[PDB]
Write a protein that binds this ligand. Structure first.
Ligand SMILES: [Mg+2]
Ligand SMILES: [Mg+2]
Ligand SMILES: [Mg+2]
Ligand SMILES: [Mg+2]
Ligand SMILES: [Mg+2]
Ligand SMILES: [Mg+2]
Ligand SMILES: [Mg+2]
Ligand SMILES: [Mg+2]
Ligand SMILES: [Zn+2]
Lengths: 148, 98, 166, 39, 300, 152, 266
RNA sequence: ACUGAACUCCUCACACCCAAUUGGACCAAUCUAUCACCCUAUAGAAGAACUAAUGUUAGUAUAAGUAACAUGAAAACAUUCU
């Protein structure tokens, strides 16, 4: 729940949308097994859909280790420093591909509650409401029950 | 009568960690001007009192030795002489018996 | 049975540079399986907590409680250790950083109640723990003034936002 | 002095006594020291 | 470490110091005797809707007084020890006068109080009590008040702290009956019985229960002054007054609407020995009272 | 309630209390010093002073003798009371019995006390002194006194 | 100028201290014995130009530190904070001894110094007179009229100083150095000269309270906090300012205090 | 005229709100067969998953530092006294 989970505000690292959309994904590290059903899907991906993916996004720099791994993992390292580490355990190829795509797309920040689906640097253009907006000035700056 | 529910630990802490039940930090304590072993105001120094007690005990023993059996208690005010009614100790006199 | 407090005296911190704060001597010492109830020990412990060794000693001398003697003994031993083994020069410069009471292993006996019945007496024991640090006893919490409170309130007032809208 | 001080504070700021009384350890531990700040 | 005045003084200094302290107080008292020649304040006349100052006296003991009808009236003796007006405050409802009481060791009094007393004349009194007053009747701080303030025949309210019997049971505190000794009640002879009912899952506020009894303030109203003894500042008041022998009590003109306007003959601010009013007899009696020395009464 | 009520409630009754007191008195007579629990000690002192006063009246008074017999259980002590203590205190009025605290008894942590008849034969108690006259405050006081004297 | 002078003097003092430090070759050790009525017959193995009798006190206990004021080393009073040259015999002195006269004088001197300090800031100082204890005040002579308000202000200043709680720094210095330090004040210079004349070694005793510095004959009390009740009674015509002050360890109590003040006022 | 649901509409997304019962889809641990080799897979099997039985045993709380329980006095630690 929201009370238990640590919260967050909406932002975008280093102002991506302003100038240039920068791929936040640096590295995908593929731990795969040569032998083992654990990583059949992973193996398949390595064989066929990884090269294409790499070609598509050259900002990402993929590593593939083939390290007699009992459970295969794909470590996604991002530009801020955060490391999203996820398993590839007994997944179909398509699913794996989808996961990879998702990893690529998203920013470096935590997958936690966001608080407001919006975030303006400069909200007010006319002026923020003080109580003295929509209040008339009196002559000589006078107030209730005064002398002169 | 019987407790209807278990008293929570927090409650218990509040009850028993409160300043009436905490031990007071006293301020009676001064140094023993002779002997330096530290003592309460309104009380004889424990260490200083000890020597005196010991002395009394030895004197008592000597008195006993002098007065063979029980039921004596003579008609003389006794004096304690160390080395020069009389009770004859030994040693030098301490720096407090005068 | 675990004993980490005892171990704690066997640490070696890597040596200092000339331009560096002194790093005061921390010193850890216990007494195990003291015949007392832990909670009783705790009051004494509390009484000692922030104080200079000397002050603590004085307090213990005149607190008429069984455990007080024991604690005093422990403190004395600690002091001795500091002077000999742990390279603390002044006895007077030791203050009590920490003092706590743990429960020792406890022995079960029968209590023999009226009617056919019986309770189980548990004959209690404590572990007394001390930490002495070198340096004068740190100054306690100065009770926050009205001004401070006011400042805090002001800060709180400032801190608010328009909550939901943007 | 405590109660008097509290009263004074109340007078100053127009508010009840209850907030000026200092809350416990658990609550303070709970409080977030580095909250997520925005804008 | 908290000290006390004596601890540090020598073997030989202490008595001298004590003497000095006594002497200063005595001097102060002496100084305080004559208020009118110093600064009299405006001495205003009596008016219908007026009030005036009271006294703080010591309940000394009781004794029997006899009337010319030949009746016992028990009287408690109230000694007006010192009693100086300490401070005046005009209009949060009415004007008021703080009056003092027994003199007490400045040694044992708080710094703030001590300073205040220094600012005034006087040594530090035991109890300060405030009287509500009308601005007609008003007098300078450090004006000594005497027994002659009250005249025989006048009626009085006396207030004091009742004798404290500590934590008491229900039988003594509230005069409950308790339960019977035999037949046999078990562990219930001096208990309160039922507290209060099933449908209430509660005990009402004010419910009479065992608790600390006495040592609270109580006022007895409309006591007749039978006599005053000017030479000793003793007031003789009919009946019984709250609290113990040697207790400080507060003595004022009575409140009851029967006695609302009987004070025209009384001295309105205070009796001033400085006068002009003539020195009083050794003791003033009410006309009903049989005096000691007068012949043995016979109904002829 | 127990207002204006002298006499603590010592033993298992009043007789018992009296007996206890008597024993203490006897001990004192024997010894000229006793370590004892502070609450009874004061009572003993009170009784003790009275006893000494009685003794002062002299052997030849029968009442006094009777009292002595009652209170000194060991019986050799009566002569001591008459032929020593009384002699010692003929100049004094009621200065006898010196009563001072002892740290605390070890087992039950009672308040303790000493009780010697004044002067006596034993090593002196480490008494509480007043501060010496040469100290700062004391000196100041002395000066003040001198000034006062000069003035008058 | 008053803004310059204080700083300059302080600097000079610091320099002197440094010079003094210079002479000893890297931690020279001496064995200093404790002569005393209690805690005998201890010896402290001290480092000579650095370590004070305060260190010794610390070694013994905290109580000693609290209550010691002068340190009789070879039957002559050192300050608690003035270093122990060579192997010697120490006694520690409280206010509550059989012979507390030495302590009293020191206390008086300290008080005088404090008064002087108060004077210097508040708005030239000739000397602190050597006044006894039965005379019922500690005075200080000053070349410049004050009201009760002024007196109150002075008292407040003193109190503030006490609160601040400064250690009484000490040095026994060459006469030339002393002269250099106080060449602006003529009276002070004269006093220094006199002092020099008095002894065979020139050995002028400079004492310092943080910023303020002064010359005085005797030793001084460790810290300003030992003063508890401190007041400034009156000024009499050079203008002699007077004071009376009782420390912690002998608190007067209200009436008594007032009496003392009155006495001082004469 | 407004307000007003899990009704209805909108952007998405859909197997994902009934007692007993019944039909399904999945699956934690283990053991074996064969795989794998920082803990996995396909199978076969089974003492196969505990927030409740005044459940069992073991520990520890609460009630609780509560109820309750001790050693006649002085001494010289010989003794005496009650
Ligand atoms: Mg049975
Ligand atoms: Mg009945
Ligand atoms: Mg019955
Ligand atoms: Mg709606
Ligand atoms: Mg619907
Ligand atoms: Mg169960
Ligand atoms: Mg209970
Ligand atoms: Mg009980
Ligand atoms: Zn001692």
């Amino acid at each position: 729940t929201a009370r238990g989970t640590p919260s967050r505000f909406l932002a975008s690292v280093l102002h991506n949308g302003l100038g240039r959309y920068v791929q936040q994904l640096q590295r995908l590290s593929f731990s795969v097994s040569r032998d083992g059903a654990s990583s059949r899907g992973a193996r398949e991906f390595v064989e066929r859909e990884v090269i294409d993916f790499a070609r598509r996004n050259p900002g990402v720099v993929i590593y593939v280790n083939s390290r007699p791994c009992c459970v295969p993992r794909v470590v996604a390292e991002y530009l801020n420093g955060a490391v999203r580490e996820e398993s590839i355990h007994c997944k179909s190829v398509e699913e794996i591909s989808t996961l990879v795509q998702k990893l690529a797309d998203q920013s470096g920040l935590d997958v936690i509650r966001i608080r407001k689906p919006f975030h303006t640097d400069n909200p007010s253009i006319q002026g923020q409401w003080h109580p003295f907006t929509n209040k008339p000035t009196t002559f000589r700056g006078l107030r209730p029950r005064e002398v002169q | 009568a019987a407790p209807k529910n278990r008293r929570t630990i927090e409650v218990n802490r509040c009850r028993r960690r409160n300043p009436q039940k905490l031990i007071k930090v006293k301020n009676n304590i001064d140094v023993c001007p002779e002997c330096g072993h530290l003592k309460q105001k309104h009380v004889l120094c424990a260490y200083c009192y000890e020597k005196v007690c010991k002395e009394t005990a030895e004197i008592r023993r000597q008195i006993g030795k002098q007065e063979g059996g029980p039921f004596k208690a003579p008609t003389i005010e006794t004096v304690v002489l160390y080395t020069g009614r009389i009770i004859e100790r030994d040693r030098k006199r301490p720096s407090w018996f005068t | 049975i675990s004993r980490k407090w005892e171990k704690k005296n066997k640490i070696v911190y890597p040596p200092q540079l000339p331009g560096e704060p002194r790093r005061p001597a921390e010193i850890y010492h216990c007494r195990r399986q003291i015949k007392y109830s832990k909670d009783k020990m705790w009051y004494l412990a509390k009484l000692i907590r922030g104080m200079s060794i000397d002050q603590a000693l004085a307090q213990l001398e005149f607190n008429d409680k069984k455990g007080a003697k024991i604690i005093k003994e422990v403190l004395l031993e600690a002091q001795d250790m500091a002077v000999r083994d742990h390279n603390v020069e002044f006895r007077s410069n030791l203050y009590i950083a920490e003092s706590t009471s743990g429960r020792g292993q406890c022995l079960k006996r029968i209590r023999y109640h009226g009617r056919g019945r019986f309770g189980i007496m548990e004959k209690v024991y404590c572990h007394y723990f001390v930490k002495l640090v070198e340096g004068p006893p740190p100054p306690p919490e100065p009770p926050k003034t009205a001004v401070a409170h006011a400042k805090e309130y002001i800060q709180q007032l400032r801190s608010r936002t328009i909550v939901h809208t943007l | 002095e405590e109660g008097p001080m509290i009263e004074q504070l109340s007078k100053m700021f127009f508010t009840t006594k209850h907030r000026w009384y200092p809350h416990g350890r658990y609550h303070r531990c709970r409080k977030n020291l580095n909250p997520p700040k925005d804008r | 470490s908290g000290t006390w005045w004596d601890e540090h003084l020598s073997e030989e200094n202490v008595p001298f110091i004590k003497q000095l302290v006594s002497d200063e107080d005595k001097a102060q008292l002496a100084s305080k005797l004559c208020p009118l020649k110093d600064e009299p304040w405006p001495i205003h006349p009596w008016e219908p809707g007026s009030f005036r100052v009271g006294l703080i006296a010591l309940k000394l003991g009781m004794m029997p007084l006899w009337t010319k009808d030949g009746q016992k009236h028990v009287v408690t003796l109230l000694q007006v020890q010192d009693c100086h007006v300490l401070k005046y405050t005009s209009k949060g409802k009415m004007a008021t006068l703080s009056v003092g009481g027994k003199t007490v060791s400045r040694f044992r009094k708080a710094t703030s109080i001590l300073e205040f007393y220094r600012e005034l004349g006087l040594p530090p009194k035991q109890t300060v009590k405030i009287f509500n007053i009308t601005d007609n009747a008003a007098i300078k701080p450090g004006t000594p008040l005497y027994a002659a303030h009250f005249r025989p025949g006048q009626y009085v309210d006396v207030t004091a702290k009742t004798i404290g019997k500590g934590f008491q049971g229900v039988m003594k505190r509230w005069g409950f009956k308790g339960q019977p000794a035999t037949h046999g009640q078990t562990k219930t002879h001096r208990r309160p019985g039922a507290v209060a009912t099933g449908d209430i899952g509660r005990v009402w506020p004010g419910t009479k229960m065992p608790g600390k009894m006495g040592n609270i303030y109580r006022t007895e109203y409309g006591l007749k002054v039978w006599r005053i003894n000017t030479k000793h500042n003793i007031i003789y008041v009919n009946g019984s007054v709250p609290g113990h022998k040697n207790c400080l009590v507060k003595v004022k003109d009575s409140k009851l609407p029967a006695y609302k306007d009987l004070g025209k003959n009384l001295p309105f601010p205070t009796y001033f020995p400085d006068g002009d009013e003539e020195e009083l007899p050794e003791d003033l009696y009410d006309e009903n009272v049989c005096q000691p020395g007068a012949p043995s009464i016979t109904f002829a | 309630i127990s207002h204006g009520r002298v006499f603590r409630r010592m033993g298992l009754g009043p007789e018992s209390r009296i007996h206890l007191l008597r024993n203490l008195l006897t001990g004192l007579v024997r010894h000229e010093r006793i370590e004892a629990p502070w609450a009874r000690v004061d009572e003993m002192r009170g009784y003790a002073e009275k006893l000494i006063d009685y003794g002062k009246l002299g052997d030849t008074n029968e009442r006094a003798m009777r009292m002595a017999d009652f209170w000194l259980t060991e019986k050799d002590l009566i002569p001591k009371l008459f032929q020593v203590l009384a002699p010692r205190y003929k100049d004094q009025t009621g200065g006898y019995t010196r009563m001072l605290q002892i740290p605390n008894r070890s087992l039950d942590r009672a308040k303790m006390a000493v009780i010697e008849y004044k002067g006596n034969c034993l090593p002196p108690l480490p008494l509480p002194r007043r501060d010496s006259h040469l100290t700062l405050l004391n000196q100041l006081l002395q000066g003040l006194r001198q000034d006062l004297r000069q003035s008058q | 100028s008053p803004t310059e002078l204080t700083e300059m003097r302080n600097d000079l003092f610091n320099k002197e201290k440094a010079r003094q430090l210079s002479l000893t070759p890297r931690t020279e050790k001496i064995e200093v014995k404790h002569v005393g009525k209690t805690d005998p017959g201890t010896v402290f193995v001290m480092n000579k130009n650095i370590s004070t009798p305060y260190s010794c006190a610390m070694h013994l206990s905290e109580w000693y530190c609290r209550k010691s004021i002068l340190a009789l080393v070879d039957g002559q009073p050192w300050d608690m904070y003035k270093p122990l040259t060579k192997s010697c015999e120490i006694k520690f002195l409280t206010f509550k001894d059989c012979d507390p006269g030495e302590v009293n004088k020191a206390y008086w001197r300290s008080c005088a110094m404090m008064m002087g300090c108060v004077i210097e800031r508040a708005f030239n100082l000739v000397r602190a007179p050597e006044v006894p204890v039965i005379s019922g005040a500690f005075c200080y002579d000053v070349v410049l009229m004050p009201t009760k308000e002024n007196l109150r202000s002075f008292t407040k200043d003193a109190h503030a100083l006490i609160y601040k709680d400064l250690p009484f720094e000490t040095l026994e210095v060459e006469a030339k150095v002393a002269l250099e330090i106080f060449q602006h004040s003529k009276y002070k210079v004269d006093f220094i000269e006199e002092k020099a004349s008095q002894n065979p070694e020139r050995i002028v005793k400079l004492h310092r309270i943080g910023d303020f510095i002064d010359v005085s004959e005797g030793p001084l009390i460790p810290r300003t906090s030992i003063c508890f009740q401190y007041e400034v009674s009156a000024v009499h015509n050079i203008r002699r300012f007077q004071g009376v002050s009782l420390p912690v360890h002998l608190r007067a109590h209200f009436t008594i205090w007032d009496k003392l003040l009155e006495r001082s006022r004469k």
